[PDB]
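Quick question: what would this complex look like in 3D?
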Amino acid sequence: TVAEYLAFEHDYHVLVILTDMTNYCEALREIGAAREEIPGRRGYPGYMYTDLATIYERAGVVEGKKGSVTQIPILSMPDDDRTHPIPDLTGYITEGQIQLSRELHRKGIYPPIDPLPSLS
Amino acid sequence: RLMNNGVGKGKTREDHKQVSDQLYSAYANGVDIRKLVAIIGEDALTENDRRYLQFADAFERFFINQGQQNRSIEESLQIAWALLSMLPQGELKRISKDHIGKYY
Amino acid sequence: KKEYTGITYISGPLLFVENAKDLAYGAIVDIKDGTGRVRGGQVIEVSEEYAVIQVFEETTGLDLATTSVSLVEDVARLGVSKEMLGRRFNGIGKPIDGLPPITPEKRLPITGLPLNPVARRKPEQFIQTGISTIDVMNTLVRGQKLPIFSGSGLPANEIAAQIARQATVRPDLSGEGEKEEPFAVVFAAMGITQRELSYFIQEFERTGALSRSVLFLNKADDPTIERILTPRMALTVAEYLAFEHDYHVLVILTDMTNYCEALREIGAAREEIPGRRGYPGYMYTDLATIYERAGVVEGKKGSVTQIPILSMPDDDRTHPIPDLTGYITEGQIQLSRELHRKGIYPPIDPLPSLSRLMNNGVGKGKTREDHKQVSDQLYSAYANGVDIRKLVAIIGEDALTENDRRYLQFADAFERFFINQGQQNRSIEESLQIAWALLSMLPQGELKRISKDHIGKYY
Amino acid sequence: PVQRKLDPNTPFLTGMRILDVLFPVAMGGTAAIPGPFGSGKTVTQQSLAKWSNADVVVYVGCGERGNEMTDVLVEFPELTDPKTGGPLMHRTVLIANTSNMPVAAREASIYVGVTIAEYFRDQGFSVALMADSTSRWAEALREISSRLEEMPAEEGYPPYLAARLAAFYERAGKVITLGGEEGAVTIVGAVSPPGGDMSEPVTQSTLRIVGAFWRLDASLAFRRHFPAINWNGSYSLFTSALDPWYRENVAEDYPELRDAISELLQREAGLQEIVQLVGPDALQDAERLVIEVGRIIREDFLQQNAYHEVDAYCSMKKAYGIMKMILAFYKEAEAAIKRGVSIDEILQLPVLERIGRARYVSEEEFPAYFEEAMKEIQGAFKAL
Amino acid sequence: MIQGVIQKIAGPAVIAKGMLGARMYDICKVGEEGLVGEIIRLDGDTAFVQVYEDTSGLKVGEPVVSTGLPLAVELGPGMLNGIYDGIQRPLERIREKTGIYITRGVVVHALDREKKWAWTPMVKPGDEVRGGMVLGTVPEFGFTHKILVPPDVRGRVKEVKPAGEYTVEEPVVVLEDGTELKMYHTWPVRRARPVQRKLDPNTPFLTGMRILDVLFPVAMGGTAAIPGPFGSGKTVTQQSLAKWSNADVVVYVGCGERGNEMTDVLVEFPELTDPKTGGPLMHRTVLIANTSNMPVAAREASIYVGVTIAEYFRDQGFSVALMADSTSRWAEALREISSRLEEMPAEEGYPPYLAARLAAFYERAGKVITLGGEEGAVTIVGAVSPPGGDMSEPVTQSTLRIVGAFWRLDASLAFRRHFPAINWNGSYSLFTSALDPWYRENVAEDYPELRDAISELLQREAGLQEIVQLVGPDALQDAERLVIEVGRIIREDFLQQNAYHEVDAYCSMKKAYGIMKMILAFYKEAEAAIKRGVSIDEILQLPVLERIGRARYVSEEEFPAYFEEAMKEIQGAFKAL
Amino acid sequence: PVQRKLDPNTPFLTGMRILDVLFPVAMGGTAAIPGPFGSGKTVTQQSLAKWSNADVVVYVGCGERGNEMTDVLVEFPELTDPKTGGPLMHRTVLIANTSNMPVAAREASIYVGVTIAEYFRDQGFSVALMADSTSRWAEALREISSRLEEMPAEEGYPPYLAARLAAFYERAGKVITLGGEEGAVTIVGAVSP
Amino acid sequence: IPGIRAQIRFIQQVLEQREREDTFRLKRIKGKIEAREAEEEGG
Ligand SMILES: Nc1ncnc2c1ncn2[C@@H]1O[C@H](COP(=O)(O)OP(=O)(O)O)[C@@H](O)[C@H]1O
């Protein structure tokens, strides 16, 4: 909300950064599962795509105005699964993804980024 | 299941179920040697394992594949015996020696 | 007396009785029909409007018009004594026998009262069973829970009967009054069939090991509530004997899988919404309620040691029953299907076995000095042999070394002389002598775990 | 009711070499033949019903096929029972209840069958119950529970399954009834898992209560290798009380021969593991000999076609003869391999095919056929 | 609160009749004899009451009394050298009554209500007191025990009592509002104690173990996690840490663990020393015990009671050290409670709280400045013992990423006689960067670079050992065998600490620095020799190898001289050959 | 309603080599493009939309990010229809209902799309509907069902998903309408497991 | 070995997924049974 305000009303160029979307998904599963609403896939409810899309799509660039909003949601694949519900829904919503590596981190490289599985 | 009562001597031919049993055994052996190949390699094979392999491939290529043609019980049994002759005698412990001598 | 008529519902196991707020939750009732035949019961879920009862055996023949319910006891109690040391009970606790019903000295409640974590002490001494593996490599000190992980077809009843007949305690090594420490055993079997019942009766009355045993038999087609009650009666009698008359007790519970299945069935029929993998959620607490009544205390001289014999259902170690059992107890012993098929009795796999409290029960003053070191060396040599056997099968006896040849022969002789023993009763000295004779087949300097002051006097 | 229940001490001969020599059943026992569809849980029960040693037979069909029950009403009043010469349909009380008749008649039929068998036992004969597909009973109970609208245990089966099954399997066994005689009710209850997995509640609750257990395998039934009895998942608990009877009525070292055969099979299994790892050519000569003896056993002593003329009822002396021949051949081949001759020649020795086809003989000329082949082996394996 | 009668009795659940006014989550004692429970639901005029005990034998019509206070502990003087159950019940005074068992419905107070202390005032009338300040002092054997003001109280003092001897039930101060402050107060265990502000990690938690304190440190606010197999010598590590740490008080929490810690601690460390006074170590310990057959509410309240008592001893101004044992057993208890409450599970069966309650226990730890202008700290080292031993279950998956350091006790390393057995290839720590400045200002100026060089030495030794055993440690070029021998020196005379010795159990920071310096000097001179072309056999036959091998067994007084002489002698004797 | 349903004997040339050589589709048929995230489904469907050989095109989107709709909106009006020569956006009726908009509008959009395609068939043209994320549609159905509080099927979805999908896909085929002239409605429904 | 471990992980995930559906249907059945028996005082 603050980002959209500053951008589309005072012409700034914001850059939103959200760490640990995994903790957000955990909080969502826990707050939802207390109302008995058909847990969808490995815990997390059915509307997790709807919610993640509710908060992601708020970043764009409107015509006529001259602001912008840009997001970089950092998330941690739970057990290096790229087929976990959280990374799957996030990859289905957002556009392009930059994937950190694990082998490059052992050899002592920083920032460990394997450009084979990443794109924009 | 209702096959041992509808086939046999006096109904189709006195050697039907025996060719059936033998074809099943030989095809199972060929299918197993497929995996043996995929583990080892085709040149490190015994001299008869290659016979079983080639029987399996000929079986899949001539007995099963038949297009849209109307065969007959006798034509199909002739094809089955042609194939079963690709293996040597005496290594077919299912058929009787009489049929073995009469058809080959 | 014969009060409490007016029931209002009958379906399956349950029976709703109308207004009765004078019955205590958990009571025990009887149900007299309109023809005379009586039954059992157990009150649950008592409220101000009705009181759900659950009958014991069956309910064929009951009607809403001619039926009455009466009280028996406010709790479940057992009349224990010392005269019940040659007898044979069943489930509830009535004698399946010819002898008359005994008279009790106190009627204890069959459950409750956990021990106090500051009124315990540490188990030190050791017990001898006769089986050489469970002696030289998996020692069984008092006050320990050491399960036996049997299998589907493997012989478990025979091992149980052999242990029950052979197992005694050796006070010759410590030094004390000989006729001061009695020994008892409280074999309790749940869910046995009809063959195993006669097998057990003959196996006991053949040797005469009945004079110091108390059997609680639970033939399979009896109701489930009795199969729930059985280990409680067993352990009640056991710890009464021990902590009241200075006995040394050894409790053997057969086929805990049958107990667990009965428990799940009772829960389901009580509408519990099973917790995990179909089993109830409170099963850890329920198991730890009976795997824990056995120990040693400070101030007494008795002890209670358990050997629950269970059976991994699908030859699995990640099933909830073996999982929680290994989680609560300290040790294990694995019967081996391969050794069974090869023809070795008693078939004990000695590699995946273990005993946590072993190092506290062996040493100078208890059995001998070279005990732990001999065990370590036997383990190492057997693992070596069992690996080089497959190695040989692949490569040939052509490209081996002398040490590998000798290790192969050692492993073979160990399987054919130390495990395979039949119906013998090997004392600890005899087992150690066999172990040293077997170890002699190796050259010195390969015994990389024993001390030379020991190698000298032996070997 | 009875006076007292005796201890079983005599076998239940059924004709099949596997289920007689390897996994026996006493004359008071129980068993279970579970396996997926396409294994032969019906061919084996019909063979037990037409080649047993009992006096009477009760064949209960609880949800079977109409054709499977009418191929018995048509053929059995033509065969000759092997004890008196009369027709075979003069000892059968079969109780048909097919798959489209009403649904509670399933449990009704099970209990009717068991009570008839107990009546005949009290009379004094030696009955042999045969319950087919006890799983249909379980599914009937599941439907009645879903109508009662109750709380179901795992997979819907009501929370009193195991009690019924135990009460039904625990009225079978030799007994001395109220007239001072002897009777027996043997039970062989098939089981049909819903995917073949031995983790269904019925497939598990039917363990822990039974004696033998004859687990059928699917791949052996695809290879057309019948019967498809898995030789390492099955087991028997009666094989230690029957040894006096074997020593008295078959041979003297028949227990030792049986032990040697079982040990050889279930040692060859371990070598077959390394075979599948590496390949059956990097093995030594003794190892390949063990593999080939195992295969000869598996194809000449544990195979049996229920549609041959004389290889459909193998007796104890015939099985013991074949075992003797196999053991002697293996012994001499071991000696020769130690000597140094090659395994290919050892296999091309035509005593292979002799002792192979030694099972299609009848039962009259076997006492001479076996002697001739035994002496021929002993000669030909020291000739070379 | 008004009483009420029972309506339904189904298992451990009891439904009260006539409670219009009872709060949620209150201890209420249901029955004729007292069976303290917990109100978990309220529907119109009733209340579901979950009882802790058996519940068997009750009848419908017996009274139910409420209390009004939600599961508090009694914080005050008297907790040192005590054994307590999960809900703060004194086990010794319980044994004095019930015999050897634990009967139903016993009522005993945590703090002894019959002992007398030496109160010494610290205020005067007409003075201003608010929450978190000091009122007096009383010496509890071993050190001076303050008497704080109950948080969230205030007023103007009116009357104190003169110094002398008074028990825990004489009101020792009386404010203006008429409130009476005693020597103790109660604090509900589910609500953290307040402070002024939370500080940041700038000070190490000096353990005494060289491996930990050098390679994988943890600040004095940290949260470490230490798994343990069955036979890897974990108990001895924990006891050595509790003996030679720099904490002032040690609290130990066990929910499922043995009744051998009792005998072991209470009879070994007393006859042995507390290595600052010689008296028993049990004079700074608050041990808490829980076996398997005790109630689940007891297990949960055990964990929370431990952390609250530690927070109190911090708020007094000390530095505490917690040791939570079997967080996995705690999670088992929590899962059983949940499955009793009919809750929809998540992956592996645990409820969707296992990640929130855990993070609510590990986030009560950290250096802090108390409400009275002081300093305090609480550091937690919680064991994580999986049923199988895989770091992928939910408990471990959350404990990792909630904790800082991680100490991978291994069993093979114990089988190779390498004690302590801490796998450096699997452990890791995160408190190195923000702790470097303390190292520069208090140990030496190159300590970071020495540490990093040693870590690289070990990394290369392992990466080489990958294939050494193939062709045996003889067919390698001289640089490789040099690396291997230096790695052996490292991991056999610096990374190994015989915790039973007399003068080798507490390696100070300067001592560890000296040893690292000597080893790196020997490596530098050996590479300087090999570069010229000396043999790889004189290198290993030199006497400096033994000289540095006997380094750690020396005392802490002669070490500077020993270090100077050793470096001089190495640099000397590494040129003549 | 129609007169009678013919059988398709004419290819639907999309332009891409794999899909015009190896796996072709008759100009009355159906298809499906399942596949994981980040594989090119959006680019493939837009390429079909901008180079197919249909008269008109009806792009439905129910659950696809609005950046794609804006891409087609601000890209097409400067392209050329490769049959006549006018702007490309003069033969497109795209329907937009993005992720943040309400839910049940998803199924409303699917049905509106198919009905518009049926009308344009009934006029005598040959249209090519290109739905998007029938998986998202099924998710909307599941939400509405669980609000109705009925019993579920395998993995949450209500036990009439198959019937709904079958009707939607069976409204597609070459037909000879009530005016006598022919027409066709292709369908290419993406899926996203 | 990693391929087999991946297969095991997938099978285990599916098997655990197909228990929560059962628990859910059981809880709904219990709710319905309570709603029905709350009206069965007499009739
Ligand atoms: N002992 C046997 N000998 C030869 N063929 C058999 C034997 N047992 C079963 N079969 C074959 O296996 C099939 C199994 O038939 P059936 O018993 O009806 O099914 P299932 O074994 O699944 O109950 C039959 O078609 C039969 O041809």
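Answer marked as accepted. Residues 1-193 of chain F form one domain.
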